[PDB]
């Protein structure tokens, strides 16, 4: 299993995404938009401390890439999403995240996959008032 995507590299190679997240979280005037910052600013030191100690909801899945296809509108590239058959034979769908330095072409059906997740609360609650989470991919590993 080799790391094809890591959120730590996303933090340093896409700092514009990080800045706007923190500014949207700290913006007291827009209370329905962005991340709450409940477990710290996205990608901050507190964030990884809370990721480490397990106070931020996390899940980990292992399985096999079953479909490499295209979702969304007006896309230029060949694929951006994968379906995953886990061992409980449940379906999981996730974007084909890669780093600048990692190669998107290694995503092939039948190759094995591991995805590690974090779930960060959004300011906007669910209609019934429950806490709603932004699904944050932390790491994607794949076999060859």
């Amino acid at each position: 299993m080799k790391t094809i995507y890591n959120f730590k590299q996303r933090i340093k190679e896409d700092p514009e995404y990080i800045r706007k997240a923190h500014e949207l979280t700290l913006n007291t005037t827009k209370p329905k938009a962005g991340l709450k910052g409940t477990y710290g600013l996205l990608g901050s030191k507190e964030w990884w401390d809370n990721l480490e100690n397990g106070s931020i909801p996390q899940k980990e899945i292992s399985g096999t890439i079953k479909k490499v296809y295209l979702t969304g509108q007006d896309n230029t590239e060949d694929f951006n999403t994968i379906d995953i058959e886990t061992e409980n034979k449940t379906l999981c769908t996730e974007g084909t995240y890669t780093n600048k330095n990692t190669d998107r072409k290694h995503y092939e059906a039948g190759k094995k996959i591991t995805i590690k997740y974090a779930f960060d609360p959004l300011k906007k609650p669910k209609p019934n008032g429950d806490i709603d989470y932004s699904k944050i991919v932390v790491e994607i590993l794949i076999s060859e």
């Binding site: 979702t71 007006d74 896309n75 951006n80 999403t81 699904k135």
Partner: protein
């Protein structure tokens, strides 16, 4: 008969649009409150259009007058749009940086406006995307 550029409003008057997005683009929408760019970055006034696509279907809420602001910088894609909006200049090369692209699509589609067609709005990645993202008020993932 063709469904115009905007059709649906909030109970408070905000303009309502639709777009089906990738997971990577949806992550940005939650965490940046922005619609990420890709080619024309089309938004639709009708759910029936975007629902036809695979991905995360999102209902986008925009500030009143958003469509009006885009139309000022608007261009028409083909002739079908050039006929319904005769007052708009034709689409050049490089519209994605300064213009909003209006395009008539999905004619004769029974699900969408009884086959009448819909005028979608391309935000590109420039001023039109900035106008929309600045006026963005709320989004809602439909499954």
């Amino acid at each position: 008969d063709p469904a115009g550029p905007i059709v649906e409003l909030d109970a408070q008057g905000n303009e309502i649009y639709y777009r089906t997005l990738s997971e990577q683009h949806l992550e940005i929408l939650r965490n940046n409150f922005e619609v990420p760019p890709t080619s024309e970055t089309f938004i639709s006034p009708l759910q029936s259009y975007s629902q036809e696509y695979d991905g995360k279907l999102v209902r986008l809420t925009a500030s009143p007058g958003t469509m009006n602001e885009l139309s000022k910088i608007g261009v028409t894609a083909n002739s079908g749009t050039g006929l319904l909006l005769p007052d708009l200049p034709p689409a050049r090369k490089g519209w994605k940086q300064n213009n909003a692209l209006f395009k008539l699509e999905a004619l004769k589609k029974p699900t969408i406006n009884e086959g009448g067609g819909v005028i979608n709005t391309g935000l590109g990645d420039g001023k039109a995307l900035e106008i929309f993202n600045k006026n963005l008020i709320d989004f809602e993932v439909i499954d």
